Design a protein around this nucleic acid. Structure first.
Ligand SMILES: [Mg+2]
Ligand SMILES: [Mg+2]
Ligand SMILES: [Mg+2]
Ligand SMILES: [Mg+2]
Ligand SMILES: [Mg+2]
Ligand SMILES: [Mg+2]
Ligand SMILES: [Mg+2]
Ligand SMILES: [Mg+2]
Ligand SMILES: [Mg+2]
Ligand SMILES: [Mg+2]
Ligand SMILES: [Mg+2]
Ligand SMILES: [Mg+2]
Ligand SMILES: [Mg+2]
Ligand SMILES: [Mg+2]
Ligand SMILES: [Mg+2]
Ligand SMILES: [Mg+2]
Ligand SMILES: [Mg+2]
Ligand SMILES: [Mg+2]
Ligand SMILES: [Mg+2]
Ligand SMILES: [Mg+2]
Ligand SMILES: [Mg+2]
Ligand SMILES: [Mg+2]
Ligand SMILES: [Mg+2]
Ligand SMILES: [Mg+2]
Ligand SMILES: [Mg+2]
Ligand SMILES: [Mg+2]
Ligand SMILES: [Mg+2]
Ligand SMILES: [Mg+2]
Ligand SMILES: [Mg+2]
Ligand SMILES: [Mg+2]
Ligand SMILES: [Mg+2]
Ligand SMILES: [Mg+2]
Ligand SMILES: [Mg+2]
Ligand SMILES: [Mg+2]
Ligand SMILES: [Mg+2]
Ligand SMILES: [Mg+2]
Ligand SMILES: [Mg+2]
Ligand SMILES: [Mg+2]
Ligand SMILES: [Mg+2]
Ligand SMILES: [Mg+2]
Ligand SMILES: [Mg+2]
Ligand SMILES: [Mg+2]
Ligand SMILES: [Mg+2]
Ligand SMILES: [Mg+2]
Ligand SMILES: [Mg+2]
Ligand SMILES: [Mg+2]
Ligand SMILES: [Mg+2]
Ligand SMILES: [Mg+2]
Ligand SMILES: [Mg+2]
Ligand SMILES: [Mg+2]
Lengths: 48, 172, 170, 119, 203, 116
RNA sequence: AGGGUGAAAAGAACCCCCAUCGGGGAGUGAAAAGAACAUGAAACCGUAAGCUCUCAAGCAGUGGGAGGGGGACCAGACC
RNA sequence: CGGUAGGGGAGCGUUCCGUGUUAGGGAGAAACGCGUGCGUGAGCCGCGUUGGACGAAGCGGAAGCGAGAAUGUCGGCUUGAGUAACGCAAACAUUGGUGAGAAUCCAAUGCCCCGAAAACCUAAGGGUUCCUCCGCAAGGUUCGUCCACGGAGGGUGAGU
């Protein structure tokens, strides 16, 4: 099956923005993790 | 003249081997963030792009320190964009004599770091005044000091610009 | 010179201070003082009172269209042939003359009623694109049309008084 | 003498494109599409400069109808108009509609004249 | 959280300044009630006499509008629904505009006493279709009127309202109740004028 | 589906996964602490504990069962020496799992499994 | 198939980010024109500011124009 | 005074030549971007916090002279999509080491696969791919400190 038409500019921008939103949730995990290693109290975690 | 001269350091990376979409995914997250937060985030992110972007931002911060004399504490990432670079094409063979095209996309990245504190004098002083008080205060000073006062980020942040050109408080 | 001073100071010294552009000389005029209200009147003017016009309006026929005219106002019409800028014309086809005390209703015309107007301009209208098109018959024609137009100003509505008025009198 | 077409193309195109400002999507981008879209625009425009003259008469008549129906139980647009004519008044429909909204008392007066004379 | 920091303070203050100055020089609104041809102020404005009057925002505002009550007992369904449609639409005001809501609200009470001529009580057929095949459903008028009688009059008026955005938004202005009582007493409903002869049936 | 299927697959077939686990535990007992993927760790717990609990009893039977799991004899003997000393009072639970930064190559979550 | 930095390589000393590439200053230059370097259209990719879309059916325009914003001098106009 | 096939009339523009080594032009030409300007239209006239050296009007002449369609054609860039795939189901694992950076580079210890080969050698072919040092733009279907890749410097010895 092929694409009978070509995908319009704006719709494509919406789909790719959806794929860019996962970056937002990743940035939240990363931030929380940083604030956890920034106290040096975690015994479950280790860095070198 | 303009705020862009006072607050801003601009840094361009050229020809980073990230493709523009991937790299955009990371750059969207750091837009508008304190330079500190952006540091730690970019250290712990999963993505590959994060490393080159990191080197870049660290650099631009160093530039604002050593060149234009800014405090690193007060840096935010004000404007960041990724634009397409030079695409290198290569041809590979497919099944049954057909070929195909691989593109090896590059990008330019532009990070513009902007001091918050610079202008803060005029900033908070003009916040201090009610809207009438300010127009009474601007009734004294010559065209010169008017232009010098109001040439902060002030007129934009509170969206007065077209109002003050209507009050005949200015010349263009 | 305070522009050159504050700009050379924001040039030479990076990170500008408020004390340099605005010296500690100016307290600002007190919010209740006359020297406050002259400025706040200059920069924030109060709406001025409306100009006086007569309370009257007429309905007049020009170029076979009917306009409502109130005096002091200018309207657009068909070109009037042989009219020059600064001409005093009189419009004699007057169907209706309203006043807030009275309304005169012609049968058809208000007799002796005259509308004095002055022709202030002779124009050409906003260009209309007349466009003729037929699909697949490979025929399109692009043609502009500018209509000539006369812009006139109503001055006064006169000579009605004798004609019989009606009223809503409750 | 070889002649490149040069700018003669892109001027034409550009002058077309200026027309098509604020068309959603690819009607504001691609030249080839923009062309068509220009023609259709000009075309509808021409059409509706003609529809217009029909439509406001539609409107005015409707408003007049409403404005009169308030007065008598039995009174219409039609009856009214017929009476305007057998009384020899020239006021056209734009004017009666505008006087209907903007000076309603006036229209009441007119009606009172028409009645008095038809009485 | 509403920040009371000098910044947001400043901004709100300024915006009320802009609004003040924009209000002072703008042309006043003069509502349409004995509204004479022109105020000395409009006279300086645009040309509203030689163009068709179109309603501005101050006019149609929802809070103004009339309310009406139709006692539907011994009324004939269709003939009443036409009246209702006229009023809801606004076709009976001099100010009528196709593109705007100038209309009223109409409250229909006693929606189970509405009357219909001839055999329709048992014949007329309200169909609605699931969207699956074999998904057709049918009621006689009477089954409906015993089950949920309001839907009958809603379904008859919605037919005569315009279709499309304005149509639907209009349809919300029709308030229907099966009992003889409506909880709208606060809105001060006027009674509905009916100029039709045949609308009232007598047994 | 799986309801109540409790085993760790490690994305390997049965044979390989067995051999993998044998290997990883001889490594853990030889070095005392190691770095792996969180999955491999969580899976490896059970078999670590099997060996320890095995050596707490010490019988020729038990020792033969350990020899037939672990790869290197030397490590087994060392176990049957050390364990009664080091773990005598600990009733179960001989491993720590301390997780870390993910791997650069694949972003595989890592972890540090320690012999506690 | 791959032409045009500048008049002249004067092709960027020195400091900073710094494993290199790449960059920001300083310096050269009429101009940075900074070596992927002269004018640099379109597609296409974005960034910012103004208005606006989550009960909606549509070759996307057009005539009517609610509400909101902008640069004016014929402030009743234009965008 | 509707108009297809089609015929007739009147025009606009492009590059070049004559006038002309013209008027004008580093006090900013062509071009590019703009217009509340003027045309029935093709277009013209005016303007530029672009551009950096050419070149109008008039009155004439000549054509490689006007594009949206040729499954035209050559370059550029999209869509599909951050999707399918990453080339066997011999299988990797851990500890050190080097390094700015290691799932992938080196070493060690296990484990696993081939063994009438997935071993060693020779004909043909290829042509420097061999070795050492340096490198990590491109190539390598990921990575890369590595390489059959790039840079230098070496290397093939016969009476049988
Ligand atoms: Mg083949
Ligand atoms: Mg292919
Ligand atoms: Mg044809
Ligand atoms: Mg040529
Ligand atoms: Mg050609
Ligand atoms: Mg538009
Ligand atoms: Mg897998
Ligand atoms: Mg087996
Ligand atoms: Mg196997
Ligand atoms: Mg067990
Ligand atoms: Mg440099
Ligand atoms: Mg290195
Ligand atoms: Mg460098
Ligand atoms: Mg410099
Ligand atoms: Mg210099
Ligand atoms: Mg260029
Ligand atoms: Mg709905
Ligand atoms: Mg909505
Ligand atoms: Mg819709
Ligand atoms: Mg003809
Ligand atoms: Mg023909
Ligand atoms: Mg010419
Ligand atoms: Mg020319
Ligand atoms: Mg030429
Ligand atoms: Mg000369
Ligand atoms: Mg010029
Ligand atoms: Mg030329
Ligand atoms: Mg021209
Ligand atoms: Mg010419
Ligand atoms: Mg020159
Ligand atoms: Mg000439
Ligand atoms: Mg040819
Ligand atoms: Mg083409
Ligand atoms: Mg092609
Ligand atoms: Mg793509
Ligand atoms: Mg798909
Ligand atoms: Mg899938
Ligand atoms: Mg897949
Ligand atoms: Mg395949
Ligand atoms: Mg493979
Ligand atoms: Mg075997
Ligand atoms: Mg081999
Ligand atoms: Mg060999
Ligand atoms: Mg050989
Ligand atoms: Mg070679
Ligand atoms: Mg080798
Ligand atoms: Mg490489
Ligand atoms: Mg690679
Ligand atoms: Mg290295
Ligand atoms: Mg080599």
């Amino acid at each position: 099956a092929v694409p009978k038409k070509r995908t319009s500019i704006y719709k494509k921008r919406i789909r790719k923005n959806i794929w860019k939103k996962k970056g937002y949730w990743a940035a939240l995990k990363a931030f929380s993790l940083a604030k956890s290693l920034s106290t040096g109290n975690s015994k479950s975690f280790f860095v070198r | 003249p303009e705020p862009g001269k006072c607050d801003e350091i601009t840094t361009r990376g050229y020809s980073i081997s990230m493709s523009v979409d991937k790299a955009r995914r990371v750059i969207d997250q750091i837009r508008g963030r304190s330079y500190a937060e952006t540091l730690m985030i970019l250290e712990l992110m999963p993505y590959r792009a994060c490393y080159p972007i990191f080197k870049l931002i660290y650099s631009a911060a160093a530039n604002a320190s050593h060149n234009k004399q800014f405090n690193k504490a007060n840096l935010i990432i004000s404007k960041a964009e990724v634009n397409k670079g030079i695409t290198l094409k290569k041809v590979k063979p497919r099944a049954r004599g057909r070929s195909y095209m691989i593109k090896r996309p590059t990008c330019h990245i532009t990070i513009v770091l902007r001091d918050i504190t610079h202008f803060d004098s005029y900033d908070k002083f003009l916040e201090s005044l009610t809207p009438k008080k300010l127009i009474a205060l601007l009734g004294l000073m010559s065209t010169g000091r008017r232009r010098e006062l109001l040439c902060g980020r002030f007129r934009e942040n509170h969206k007065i610009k077209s109002f003050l050109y209507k009050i005949a408080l200015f010349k263009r | 010179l305070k522009a050159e001073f504050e700009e050379f100071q924001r040039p030479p010294n990076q990170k500008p201070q408020l004390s340099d552009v605005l010296p500690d000389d100016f307290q600002a005029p007190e919010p209740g003082t006359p020297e406050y209200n002259d400025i706040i009147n200059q920069f924030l003017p109060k709406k001025g009172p409306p100009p006086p016009r007569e309370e009257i309006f007429a309905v007049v026929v020009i170029g076979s269209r009917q306009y409502i005219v109130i005096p002091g106002r200018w309207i657009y019409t068909q070109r009037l042939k042989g009219a020059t800028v600064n001409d005093k014309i009189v419009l004699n086809k007057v169907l209706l003359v309203g006043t807030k005390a009275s309304t005169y209703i012609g049968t058809p015309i208000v007799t002796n009623a005259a509308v004095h107007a002055v022709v202030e301009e002779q124009l050409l209208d906003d260009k209309v694109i007349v466009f003729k098109y037929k699909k697949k018959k490979n025929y399109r024609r692009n043609i502009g049309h500018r209509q000539p137009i006369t812009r006139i100003k109503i001055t006064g509505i006169t000579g009605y008084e004798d004609y019989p008025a009606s009223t809503l009198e409750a | 003498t070889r002649v490149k077409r040069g700018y003669i193309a892109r001027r034409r195109r550009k002058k077309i494109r200026f027309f098509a400002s604020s068309f959603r999507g690819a009607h504001s981008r691609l030249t080839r599409t923009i062309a068509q879209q220009k023609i259709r625009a000009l075309v509808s425009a021409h059409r509706d400069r003609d529809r217009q003259k029909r439509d406001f008469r539609r409107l005015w008549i409707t408003r007049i109808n409403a404005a009169i129906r308030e007065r008598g139980v039995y009174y219409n647009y039609s009856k009214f108009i017929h009476d305007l004519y057998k009384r020899q008044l020239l006021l056209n429909r734009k004017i009666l509609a505008q006087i209907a909204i903007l000076n309603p008392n006036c229209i009441y007066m007119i009606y009172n004249e028409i009645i008095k004379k038809e009485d | 959280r509403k920040s009371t920091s000098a910044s947001t303070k400043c901004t709100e203050e300024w915006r009320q300044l802009k609004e003040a100055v924009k209000k002072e020089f703008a042309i006043p609104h003069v509502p349409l009630d004995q509204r004479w041809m022109f105020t000395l102020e409009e006279a300086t404005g645009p040309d509203i006499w030689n163009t068709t009057w179109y309603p501005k925002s101050a006019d149609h505002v929802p809070t103004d509008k009339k309310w009406y009550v139709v006692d539907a007992t011994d009324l004939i369904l269709g003939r009443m629904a036409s009246t209702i449609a006229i009023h809801i639409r606004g076709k009976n005001l001099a100010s009528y505009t196709p593109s705007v809501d100038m209309g009223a609200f109409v409250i229909v009470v006693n929606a189970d006493k509405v009357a219909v001529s001839g055999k329709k009580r048992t014949q007329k057929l309200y169909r609605r279709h699931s969207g699956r095949p074999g998904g057709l459903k049918e009621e006689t008028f009477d089954q409906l009127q015993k089950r949920i009688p309001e839907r009958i009059i809603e379904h008859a008026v919605r037919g005569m309202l315009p279709k499309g955005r304005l149509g639907r938004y209009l349809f919300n202005h029709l308030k229907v109740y099966k009992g003889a009582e409506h909880p709208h007493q606060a809105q001060q409903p006027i009674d509905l004028p009916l100029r039709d002869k045949r609308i009232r049936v007598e047994k | 589906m799986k309801h109540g299927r409790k085993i760790h697959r490690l994305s390997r077939p049965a044979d390989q996964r067995r051999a993998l686990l044998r290997g990883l535990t001889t490594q853990l007992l030889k070095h005392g602490r190691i770095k792996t993927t969180r999955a491999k760790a969580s899976a490896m717990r059970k078999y670590v504990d099997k060996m320890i609990t095995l050596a707490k009893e010490g019988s020729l039977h038990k020792r033969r069962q350990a020899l037939g799991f672990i790869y290197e004899k030397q490590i087994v003997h060392a176990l049957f020496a050390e364990v009664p000393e080091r773990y005598g009072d600990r009733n179960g639970g001989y491993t720590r799992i301390i997780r870390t930064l993910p791997r650069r190559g694949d972003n595989a979550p890592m972890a540090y499994i320690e012999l506690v």
